[PDB]
From a paper:
Protein lysine methyltransferases (PKMTs) comprise a subfamily of posttranslational modifying enzymes that transfer a methyl group from the cofactor S-adenosyl-L-methionine (SAM). SETD8 (SET8/Pr-SET7/KMT5A) is the sole PKMT annotated for monomethylation of histone H4 lysine 20 (H4K20me) and many nonhistone targets such as the tumor suppressor p53 and the p53-stabilizing factor Numb. Here we solved four distinct crystal structures of SETD8 in alternative ligand-binding states with covalent SETD8 inhibitors and native ligands.
Strikingly, BC-SAM and APO differ from TC by their distinct SET-I motifs in the context of the otherwise similar SET-domain. Furthermore, the post-SET motif of APO structurally resembles an intermediate state between BC-Inh1 and BC-Inh2 but is distinct from those of BC-SAM and TC. The differences between these structures highlight the conformational plasticity of the SET-I and post-SET motifs. In the apo landscape, the general structural features of the X-ray structures of BC-Inh1, BC-Inh2, APO, BC-SAM and TC are recapitulated by a subset of macrostates (e.g. A6 for BC-Inh1; A10 for BC-Inh2; A12 for APO; A20 for BC-SAM; A22, A24 for TC, 6 of 24 macrostates, Figure 11).
Author numbering: 189 to 267, 269 to 350
Protein backbone atom coordinates (compact mmCIF):
# COMPACT_ATOMS: atom_id res chain seq x y z
CA UNK A 1 0.00 0.00 0.00
CA UNK A 2 2.66 2.55 -1.06
CA UNK A 3 0.24 4.90 -2.92
CA UNK A 4 -0.17 8.34 -1.28
CA UNK A 5 -3.32 8.42 0.89
CA UNK A 6 -6.02 10.72 -0.50
CA UNK A 7 -7.54 13.60 1.50
CA UNK A 8 -10.71 11.51 1.23
CA UNK A 9 -8.99 8.35 2.51
CA UNK A 10 -7.59 10.29 5.51
CA UNK A 11 -11.03 11.67 6.42
CA UNK A 12 -12.43 8.11 6.12
CA UNK A 13 -9.74 6.82 8.49
CA UNK A 14 -10.39 9.63 10.96
CA UNK A 15 -14.13 8.85 10.87
CA UNK A 16 -13.28 5.22 11.78
CA UNK A 17 -10.90 6.40 14.54
CA UNK A 18 -13.64 8.67 15.94
CA UNK A 19 -16.25 5.84 15.88
CA UNK A 20 -13.86 3.77 18.02
CA UNK A 21 -13.06 6.52 20.52
CA UNK A 22 -16.81 7.18 20.88
CA UNK A 23 -17.28 3.41 21.32
CA UNK A 24 -14.43 3.12 23.82
CA UNK A 25 -14.89 6.47 25.59
CA UNK A 26 -11.08 6.80 25.63
CA UNK A 27 -10.02 10.41 25.90
CA UNK A 28 -6.44 11.55 25.49
CA UNK A 29 -4.79 14.93 25.25
CA UNK A 30 -6.88 16.87 27.78
CA UNK A 31 -7.14 17.22 31.56
CA UNK A 32 -9.19 19.25 33.99
CA UNK A 33 -7.29 22.23 35.38
CA UNK A 34 -7.81 25.26 37.63
CA UNK A 35 -7.21 28.49 35.73
CA UNK A 36 -6.09 31.64 37.53
CA UNK A 37 -8.93 34.20 37.49
CA UNK A 38 -11.52 31.80 36.10
CA UNK A 39 -11.63 28.48 38.00
CA UNK A 40 -12.26 25.08 36.46
CA UNK A 41 -11.81 24.46 32.76
CA UNK A 42 -10.32 21.88 30.43
CA UNK A 43 -6.82 22.31 28.95
CA UNK A 44 -4.95 20.65 26.05
CA UNK A 45 -2.09 18.42 27.29
CA UNK A 46 -0.77 17.90 23.73
CA UNK A 47 -0.80 19.69 20.38
CA UNK A 48 -3.94 19.65 18.21
CA UNK A 49 -3.90 20.50 14.56
CA UNK A 50 -6.63 22.57 12.99
CA UNK A 51 -9.46 20.19 12.15
CA UNK A 52 -8.43 17.46 14.64
CA UNK A 53 -11.07 15.64 16.66
CA UNK A 54 -10.76 16.85 20.26
CA UNK A 55 -13.49 15.16 22.32
CA UNK A 56 -17.07 13.97 22.07
CA UNK A 57 -19.58 16.10 23.93
CA UNK A 58 -20.80 13.09 25.86
CA UNK A 59 -23.99 12.81 27.95
CA UNK A 60 -27.58 11.55 27.55
CA UNK A 61 -29.22 12.06 24.15
CA UNK A 62 -32.86 13.20 24.44
CA UNK A 63 -35.16 13.71 21.47
CA UNK A 64 -37.49 16.74 21.62
CA UNK A 65 -40.71 16.60 19.59
CA UNK A 66 -43.07 19.45 20.55
CA UNK A 67 -42.93 23.16 19.69
CA UNK A 68 -43.07 24.40 23.32
CA UNK A 69 -40.17 22.15 24.44
CA UNK A 70 -38.22 23.36 21.36
CA UNK A 71 -38.88 27.01 22.38
CA UNK A 72 -37.63 26.22 25.90
CA UNK A 73 -34.44 24.77 24.37
CA UNK A 74 -33.92 27.69 21.96
CA UNK A 75 -34.55 30.46 24.49
CA UNK A 76 -31.65 29.23 26.78
CA UNK A 77 -28.65 31.39 27.72
CA UNK A 78 -25.04 29.98 27.83
CA UNK A 79 -24.62 31.30 31.42
CA UNK A 80 -26.18 27.13 34.42
CA UNK A 81 -26.93 23.48 33.58
CA UNK A 82 -27.27 24.67 29.95
CA UNK A 83 -28.52 21.86 27.73
CA UNK A 84 -26.71 21.89 24.37
CA UNK A 85 -29.05 21.12 21.44
CA UNK A 86 -29.00 20.52 17.64
CA UNK A 87 -31.10 19.60 14.59
CA UNK A 88 -30.46 16.36 12.77
CA UNK A 89 -32.47 14.71 9.96
CA UNK A 90 -35.63 16.77 10.78
CA UNK A 91 -35.36 15.86 14.51
CA UNK A 92 -34.41 18.02 17.53
CA UNK A 93 -32.03 16.63 20.14
CA UNK A 94 -30.44 17.86 23.27
CA UNK A 95 -27.71 16.29 25.39
CA UNK A 96 -28.20 16.14 29.14
CA UNK A 97 -24.71 16.37 30.63
CA UNK A 98 -25.70 16.71 34.30
CA UNK A 99 -24.71 13.21 35.47
CA UNK A 100 -21.23 13.26 36.95
CA UNK A 101 -18.88 11.26 34.69
CA UNK A 102 -15.19 11.05 33.82
CA UNK A 103 -15.99 12.27 30.24
CA UNK A 104 -14.44 15.75 29.83
CA UNK A 105 -16.35 17.40 26.92
CA UNK A 106 -19.17 18.50 29.29
CA UNK A 107 -16.59 20.49 31.30
CA UNK A 108 -15.19 22.57 28.42
CA UNK A 109 -16.07 26.24 29.05
CA UNK A 110 -18.07 28.62 26.84
CA UNK A 111 -16.56 31.42 24.81
CA UNK A 112 -17.47 33.53 21.79
CA UNK A 113 -13.69 33.71 21.12
CA UNK A 114 -12.87 30.00 21.43
CA UNK A 115 -10.50 27.58 19.71
CA UNK A 116 -12.94 24.67 19.14
CA UNK A 117 -16.11 24.17 17.13
CA UNK A 118 -18.89 21.62 17.29
CA UNK A 119 -19.63 19.10 14.57
CA UNK A 120 -22.21 16.38 14.05
CA UNK A 121 -20.89 12.88 13.48
CA UNK A 122 -23.15 10.08 12.26
CA UNK A 123 -22.86 6.54 13.65
CA UNK A 124 -25.40 4.31 11.92
CA UNK A 125 -27.95 7.16 11.88
CA UNK A 126 -27.31 8.23 15.49
CA UNK A 127 -25.95 11.80 15.66
CA UNK A 128 -22.91 12.34 17.89
CA UNK A 129 -21.81 15.78 18.91
CA UNK A 130 -18.06 16.17 18.77
CA UNK A 131 -15.62 19.02 19.24
CA UNK A 132 -13.02 19.78 16.60
CA UNK A 133 -10.02 22.13 16.75
CA UNK A 134 -10.81 25.38 14.87
CA UNK A 135 -7.08 26.11 14.67
CA UNK A 136 -3.69 24.71 15.76
CA UNK A 137 -3.87 24.34 19.54
CA UNK A 138 -0.85 24.10 21.85
CA UNK A 139 -0.43 21.95 24.94
CA UNK A 140 -1.48 24.17 27.88
CA UNK A 141 -4.26 26.13 26.14
CA UNK A 142 -7.74 26.00 27.62
CA UNK A 143 -10.27 24.43 25.27
CA UNK A 144 -13.22 26.74 24.55
CA UNK A 145 -16.19 26.79 22.15
CA UNK A 146 -19.36 28.82 21.62
CA UNK A 147 -22.31 27.15 23.40
CA UNK A 148 -24.61 29.37 21.27
CA UNK A 149 -23.22 28.36 17.79
CA UNK A 150 -26.52 26.70 16.66
CA UNK A 151 -29.10 28.92 18.41
CA UNK A 152 -29.71 31.49 15.65
CA UNK A 153 -30.35 28.79 12.98
CA UNK A 154 -32.65 26.86 15.39
CA UNK A 155 -34.59 29.95 16.55
CA UNK A 156 -35.17 31.20 12.95
CA UNK A 157 -36.68 27.84 11.94
CA UNK A 158 -39.10 27.71 14.93
CA UNK A 159 -42.81 27.75 13.77
CA UNK A 160 -43.76 30.40 16.38
CA UNK A 161 -41.46 33.02 14.71
Amino acid sequence: GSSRKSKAELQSEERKRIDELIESGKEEGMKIDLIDGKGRGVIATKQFSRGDFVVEYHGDLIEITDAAARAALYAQDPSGCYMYYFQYLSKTYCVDATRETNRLGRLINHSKCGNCQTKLHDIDGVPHLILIASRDIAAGEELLYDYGDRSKASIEAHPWL
